């Protein structure tokens, strides 16, 4: 059963792809991000600030008002973006304070409202990266920003996190997505290997109506070759 | 060989352990932290702020001040602390803060003034938890920043991230220290589990000094039972 998704990133390539299919299935849904989603049931527009806590509490106090005693079915934090380097680079500071608000503060502030606003029985997904299982020499800040939600998934799914009974909390790893931007960025990839939007959008659609839903605190890999996508368990 | 030892934590109290002890055997030794170690060689104050890339660059350019082209033998990051907390305690945005400026930022500025002023061959010791390989439910901003410093850790160990030639990135993984606040916090808890200061001291002299060096991209893990501690590589 699904009617509420809450999608923390609404205003990305694959958030916006989100809220316009499941308000298609006329199901509620609310957008979080740093511009409206004119499109969604409900914006929430996240603060732009360095203080996290400011940030944080900003987004639960705006998402407790709008919700009040109702529960949703899902959250999807589909949060984030991309950035390189390694170590000895000059914009690693920059990069790094990028990745970490991007996916450390978003999947966090995620994790949080799912305790309070999760139906149980609900789903709680977060956006991992495959390349991260390994380490990233030159992509230390992506590296270790999405790290730590694949081990945020495995406290989630620990007993007594926070998490309602039967709610799930699975990680999705990609390698990389089909996105405008990304073809007019490596015009020369292959994009046989990029993941649709749209595959992954069925694949929210159906975990949340009951249908194939892995484990919590699964890690999933999505990896697409020659325009075919599967889907691999990984261990944390 | 050894004579330059940078300790990033130099005011906590493993860190003043470790400038005290190299200070004993007339090593130079700088202390990095948000407070003067009188003890040091050179202390650098680390500055307060919500920004990352404010502190960042400050330490970055207080550094490269105090060395110039002056390779150091080691970088030994033990800034940390603790703080505990499920999803769903309003303590939460609060503690994950702290666990993040204390062991991802740290971590990270580390690691950049290494691939700049360690020496070839030279040691950089990360600080990451046992408890973090696997899910921390009532531990989320704990466990989070732990595991980001494990997957830098090898994303270190990874070729061309920064790291000079023979250079080794380690993370020691403690479960706990014997510290008098740890002894008046944990009043009936078995001290005799608790790691020793001074053993770990002794450790990161042996490694600085050529003796039994771990591989790069290394997980130790540090266990003390009955008093006698031993060291247990991990994977991740
Ligand atoms: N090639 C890839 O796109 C690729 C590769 C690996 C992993 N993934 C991961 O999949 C996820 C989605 O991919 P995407 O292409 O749609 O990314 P995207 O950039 O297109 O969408 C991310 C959206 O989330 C928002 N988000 C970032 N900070 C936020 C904040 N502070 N508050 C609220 N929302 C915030 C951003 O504003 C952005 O609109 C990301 O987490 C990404 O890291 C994607
Ligand atoms: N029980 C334990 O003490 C325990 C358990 C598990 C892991 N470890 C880890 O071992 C390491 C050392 O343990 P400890 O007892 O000496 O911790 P500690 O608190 O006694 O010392 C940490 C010091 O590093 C500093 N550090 C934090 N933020 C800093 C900053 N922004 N700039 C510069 N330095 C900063 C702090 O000010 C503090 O003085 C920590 O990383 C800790 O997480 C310890």
Request: with cysteine.
């Given at each position: 059963?699904?009617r509420?998704?809450?999608?923390?990133?609404?205003?990305?390539?694959?958030?916006?792809?989100?809220?316009?299919?499941?308000?298609?299935?006329?199901?509620?849904?609310?957008?979080?991000?740093?511009?409206?989603?004119?499109?969604?049931?409900?914006?929430?527009?996240?603060?732009?600030?360095?203080?996290?806590?400011?940030?944080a509490?900003?987004?639960?106090?705006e998402?407790?008002?709008?919700?009040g005693?109702?529960?949703?079915?899902?959250?999807?934090?589909?949060?984030?973006?991309?950035?390189?380097?390694?170590?000895?680079?000059?914009?690693?500071?920059?990069?790094?304070?990028?990745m970490?608000?991007?996916?450390?503060?978003?999947?966090?502030?995620?994790?949080?409202?799912?305790?309070?606003?999760?139906?149980e029985?609900?789903?709680?997904?977060?956006?991992?990266?495959?390349?991260?299982?390994?380490?990233?020499?030159?992509?230390?800040?992506?590296?270790?920003?999405?790290?730590?939600?694949?081990?945020?998934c495995?406290?989630?799914?620990?007993?007594?996190?926070?998490?309602?009974?039967?709610?799930?909390?699975?990680?999705?790893?990609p390698?990389?997505?089909?996105?405008p931007?990304?073809?007019?960025?490596?015009?020369?990839?292959?994009?046989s290997?990029?993941?649709?939007?749209?595959?992954?959008?069925?694949?929210?659609?159906?975990?949340?109506?009951?249908?194939?839903?892995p484990?919590?605190?699964?890690?999933?890999?999505?990896?697409?070759?020659?325009?075919?996508?599967?889907?691999?368990?990984?261990?944390?």
């Amino acid at each position: 059963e699904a009617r509420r998704v809450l999608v923390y990133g609404g205003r990305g390539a694959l958030g916006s792809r989100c809220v316009q299919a499941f308000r298609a299935r006329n199901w509620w849904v609310a957008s979080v991000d740093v511009v409206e989603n004119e499109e969604a049931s409900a914006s929430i527009i996240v603060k732009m600030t360095d203080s996290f806590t400011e940030q944080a509490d900003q987004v639960t106090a705006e998402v407790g008002k709008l919700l009040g005693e109702e529960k949703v079915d899902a959250i999807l934090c589909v949060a984030g973006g991309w950035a390189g380097g390694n170590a000895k680079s000059k914009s690693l500071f920059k990069n790094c304070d990028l990745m970490w608000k991007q996916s450390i503060w978003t999947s966090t502030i995620s994790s949080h409202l799912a305790t309070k606003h999760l139906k149980e029985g609900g789903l709680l997904t977060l956006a991992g990266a495959k390349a991260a299982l390994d380490g990233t020499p030159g992509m230390i800040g992506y590296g270790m920003a999405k790290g730590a939600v694949h081990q945020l998934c495995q406290s989630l799914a620990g007993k007594n996190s926070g998490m309602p009974p039967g709610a799930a909390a699975i990680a999705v790893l990609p390698v990389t997505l089909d996105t405008p931007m990304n073809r007019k960025s490596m015009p020369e990839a292959d994009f046989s290997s990029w993941t649709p939007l749209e595959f992954l959008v069925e694949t929210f659609h159906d975990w949340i109506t009951g249908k194939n839903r892995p484990s919590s605190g699964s890690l999933i890999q999505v990896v697409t070759t020659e325009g075919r996508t599967e889907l691999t368990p990984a261990y944390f």
